[PDB]
């Protein structure tokens, strides 16, 4: 034909999949590099315990996952289903992260 899922169907397949699992979703080595880059621009010659990087990734992903729930609510409140920077900014603002 070839067969083809309608737009929206694989997206719901993926919500169900990643809401079922708990594994980290950002790749380890790239994230370790981001952390060492931010760290270095704050103090030089720093070393990291591996569990320290792992703790930061766990927290960073729990934060972003939690923010996208709030963002999704703001999109739906606007009668959309597409999250946009307006929504992240509105979520962030009400969260009191930055009013």
């Amino acid at each position: 034909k070839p067969h083809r899922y309608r737009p929206g169907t694989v997206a719901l397949r993926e919500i169900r999949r990643y809401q079922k699992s708990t594994e980290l979703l950002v790749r380890k080595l790239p994230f370790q590099r981001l952390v060492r880059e931010i760290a270095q621009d704050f103090k030089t010659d720093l070393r990291f315990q591996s569990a320290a990087i792992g703790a930061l990734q766990e927290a960073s992903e729990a934060y972003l996952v939690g923010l996208f729930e709030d963002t999704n609510l703001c999109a739906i409140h606007a009668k959309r289903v597409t999250i946009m920077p307006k929504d992240i900014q509105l979520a962030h603002s009400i969260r009191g992260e930055r009013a």
């Binding site: 929206g8 169907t9 719901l12 919500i15 169900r16 809401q19 079922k20 699992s21 708990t22 594994e23 703790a55 766990e58 927290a59 729990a62 996952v65 999704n72 609510l73 739906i76 289903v81």
Partner: protein, 108 residues
């Protein structure tokens, strides 16, 4: 002298009354600690451990596993109104999230 009884056994508890007493004196909470304060606190801590492990073990059963992993802890916390409020600012490493899709997102 007499044979030694642990203050936990005196208190009827699994959690360590003596250690909880030491952590209170060492934690700079007050000049003095009464004798009942570690007993009462070890009791509350063990009761809460018991309530979480109860619901976690159930989640492990529902998921056909016999070993509690962080997922099971997370499902136990998030599905209980009161643990979820007690821990609503806490992140459980490797816990993931509750399956929840807003209705309006489902195929129309």
């Amino acid at each position: 002298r007499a044979k030694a009884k642990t203050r936990s056994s005196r208190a009827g508890l699994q959690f360590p009354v003596g250690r909880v007493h030491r952590l209170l004196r060492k934690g700079n909470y007050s000049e003095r600690v009464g004798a009942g304060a570690p007993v009462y606190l070890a009791a509350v801590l063990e009761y809460l451990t018991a309530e979480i492990l109860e619901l976690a073990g159930n989640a492990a059963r529902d998921n056909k596993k016999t070993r509690i992993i962080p997922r099971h802890l997370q499902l136990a916390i998030r599905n209980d109104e009161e643990l979820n409020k007690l821990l609503g600012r806490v992140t459980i490493a490797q816990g993931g999230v509750l399956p929840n899709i807003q209705a309006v997102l489902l195929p129309k």
